[PDB]
């Protein structure tokens, strides 16, 4: 059983300990649930105002007296500011409620618009993670590697990547805890990430996986968490992406196949079909 | 008397030295005060325009001449853009004021909407601080600890924590000042904060609390300030949270009870009911 | 003649080398100029549409034929979406222009609103700089100092300060250039800036002002640039503030008077009236 | 053939591997294509509603029965909330569709406004890169240099620059890959970038171009990538700019001509006409 999902999530059941977190909930519900809630408020509030018009007499011209249907659509046409002409307020009481309803609709529209904007303008990084990792020799040291690819043409600037080892360990006192280890990389910052980025961790005497083998990583239930962050030119916003690997997904001795190929014309090309391809010696 | 409140605020009375800070004030007033101010401008400006229509003659059809009530609701129906039909401008003077009023309402609506958005889209971190701290041995050193918990399912990426010692000290010259000490942590950056995070400060010869005891921390009036910062996936915005501890809230020899429990099914679980539980030896 | 103004600006005349920078210009013009430009577009575009209605015949009911005045206010009432009733489109040509005008007004309103929001939501740090600096002994070293004060109750988190020396220097080749020197501080990051922050630069053998005197700083035309940055809780946005000092504004041997005073009640207080006070020995 | 364009882009053909990326596409299409798509939805949705009114009978007063033209403009006047008066809904079915259409238009307007804002508020850094680089002696070491200029009066705070060497290299195993080298600079952070900034890389034993010549940089196909980032006061947003140089654009022995000149009045001036001027010895 893996403690981190492939997408970077945690696979832990939350035991624990309708308006205490209203701003969060309105942003995280699905769009159908969101559109439903907005429609609800839109109707409930109109009904309320419709009842406020009947509670002061027949103050709506060309409206069947005491008819809720005719009063509702007058509220609709008032809150929306359509103002057809047939239905119109008469009497100082109705005109004051109209004044209030218009204010209430503007304030509610601004809140709904704020939430729509906040939900809609959530960019995705468009970054692809290698399905596996590898441990092969690079510059004379065994090196843990994975790689990233930009699925869009627009570039990502000040791109950062963080490679975390997650394994169970035993302290000097004998306490069995789960520790996170920041793994030093040859390059943790790519100022302009455009195409493909091979991320490397030299396994030297300082590495927390020095001397480890395929077996020891399983016994410690080792996992590898990857976080990517950058500023996407397409959106002019920051983006991020997360991924996680299990020890079973490290191909020892593997080499990532070059995704850069030379066309017959001499043009340098990027073939992402080889992105997950790994060469093994037998 | 504590100099920092539990929530991270300062407990200092500001001796010191209605429009000099209008943007700040409009964002910091309570919602009832905010809604009240907006309603005020909404009525005052309409009244002003209503008086601008009477100051040019009876230029409102179906409106009692010189009646402010009928002129006000015409301004309302004009600023809001309802445009029922009974009340309508007549004469080039009224139609020019209508043109101005519509412009004034759009500009005011945009400012009101900007403020609403700015006030509404203020996410909260949803982070829980341990009620106490502890000082127990970890990896062979006495270690100061507290811990954090994410009260939501959505993860927080690039989470940072900063642990500051605040105590009165005496310089070589004899000046008694209050100094802030950044306390080095085993982990100050958690790339993906999902569940629980135990923060640790090894008390070695470099620590500003090396050799200190429960008594010395009180005599120096020592306090501990904690700041948390991260990027919350739920909101796609940054969040932060602050907390402060007094020396009286350090449980020497204490150990935080594990909040990770193993269910009978083998599923890993998170029980936040034990989050504030601390084990003491007697 | 000083090369940096007290507010951090540069005092250099730009020799150099109406729509090439439209987004910048619309954000930087004064509000009167901005409101004027928006009003302009609002009238010009309405006039244009008014001429588009006459160029297709008398397609406006209750409108004097060929009258521009009556056609303009119909465009106003259409672009604003008031729709009184007297003036109404007749014929497929007018109704198509109405359809276009409504689209054009919505698109223009969205751009105007975007600019209003972008201009309006520009918070100010509310930070006060000490009028002078000082060089006195602290912890056994001559230390350059200034201090900052938060003029608001809301706190600023992850506050950074940067102290830059700016002076003319001569390279080994003999080139006379103006170099910026980052001055190391005892604390460059205050995780929670609430009240007052004394910023200190120990003048040791590593400092670029080691061995300098009041005279040498003038001969080199030394200046000191200060930048402050933080995340203001009042606005939930980042803020910054800049200041610059001349050598003539360093009080050698000076000590900033404590702004923290003890009231008779035992409450700790902050008296910003002493913020610019400096003690000198004679 | 150069692998990086002068503007920092990559010159690689993407081989690869209409709604899968809708938010990205709507932000990256040209304004004519964007305005066209918005106009499309604006008409298609109105047509749909127009057909929803005919599919329930002649429920539009003063509208030719079964006429799509008259029903379309009623939808327009309803979605836009103009509400002239001639065309008006009759029957509970039409008034319910009107209620729905108004809701649909508000929701669509909010999405369109969000996209407009997101597209419009994309500031440009206004930064100028030197057309060439140089390698001359500075402080006793051969130093690689280029420089930047602020084309606007407003200052940029916390300005960062990153200089990356890009060249083909051979690992100990014999693998021919393209490596990025972060080049250490005398100053990588300018807290307040106002005028001109000469960026310098001392070529010492640590530099990856130590011992290299004009010939060796070509044989390795060396290129130099520059990224600039800062917070622009004009916009209160972050900005960035990228540039790339080829080995053919390094002027060995060159010196950038001083852009700071002394006027006859003693005022310090900035002449950006000399910004690309470089002095060579013969
Ligand atoms: C002030 C509300 C008027 C129309 C909607 C705009 C809200 C963002
Ligand atoms: C330009 C104002 C029209 C309606 C309100 C939108 C302001 C955000
Ligand atoms: C889509 C424009 C309708 C009203 C103004 C809202 C623009 C932010
Ligand atoms: C809620 C929509 C009403 C008018 C347009 C405002 C959308 C930002
Ligand atoms: K409205
Ligand atoms: K209307
Ligand atoms: K009407
Ligand atoms: K909006
Ligand atoms: K907005
Ligand atoms: K409006
Ligand atoms: K808005
Ligand atoms: K409108
Ligand atoms: K807005
Ligand atoms: K509308
Ligand atoms: K309207
Ligand atoms: K409207
Ligand atoms: K908007």
Residue numbers in the entry:
A (entry chain A), B (entry chain A), C (entry chain A), D (entry chain A): 12 to 28, 33 to 297
Quote the authors verbatim.
We have utilised the prokaryotic Kir channel KirBac3.1 to determine whether the acyl tails of bound lipids, protruding into the conduction pathway through fenestrations just below the selectivity filter, might represent key gating elements. In KirBac3.1, the four Leu124 residues form a steric cluster physically occluding the conduction pathway, separating the cavity into upper and lower vestibules, while Tyr132 (at the inner helix bundle) forms a non-occlusive hourglass-shaped portal between lower vestibule and cytosol. Here we present evidence that in Kir channels, a limiting barrier to permeation within the conduction pathway is formed by a collar of branched aliphatic side chains. We show that acyl tails of tightly bound lipids occupying conserved fenestrations into the pore engage individual side chains of the collar, drawing them away from the central conduction pathway and allowing ions to pass.
Reasoning that the chemistry of the contributing side chains determines their mutual affinity and propensity to form a steric barrier, we mutated the branched aliphatic residue Leu124 to the linear methionine, which is similar in both molecular volume and hydrophobicity, but more flexible. Conversely, L124M assays showed enhanced channel activity, significantly outperforming KirBac3.1 in the fluorometric assay. We determined a crystal structure of L124M in case the increased activity was due to structural distortion (such as forcing the inner helices apart). The mutation was made on a background in which two native cysteines were mutated to serine (C71S-C262S; SCS) and thus we also determined a structure of the KirBac3.1-SCS background crystallised under the same conditions. We also carried out single-channel recordings of the reconstituted L124M channels in lipid bilayers, revealing currents exhibiting the sub-conductance states typifying KirBac3.113. We also carried out simulations on the L124M mutant, using the crystal structure as a starting model, finding a negligible barrier to K+ permeation at the collar. We reasoned that if the leucine collar is the primary permeation gate and the role of the lipid tails is to competitively displace individual leucine side chains, thereby compromising the collar, lipids should not be required for permeation in the L124M mutant with its labile methionine sidechains. Indeed, L124M with all four Tyr57 adopting gauche rotamers appeared as effective at conducting K+ as wild type KirBac3.1 with all Tyr57 side chains trans, indicating that the interaction with aliphatic lipid tails in wild type is only required because of the inflexible steric occlusion created by Leu124 residues. In simulations, the L124M mutant was able to conduct even when lipid tails were prevented from entering fenestrations, demonstrating the unbranched aliphatic residue methionine does not form a significant barrier to permeation; L124M is essentially ungated.
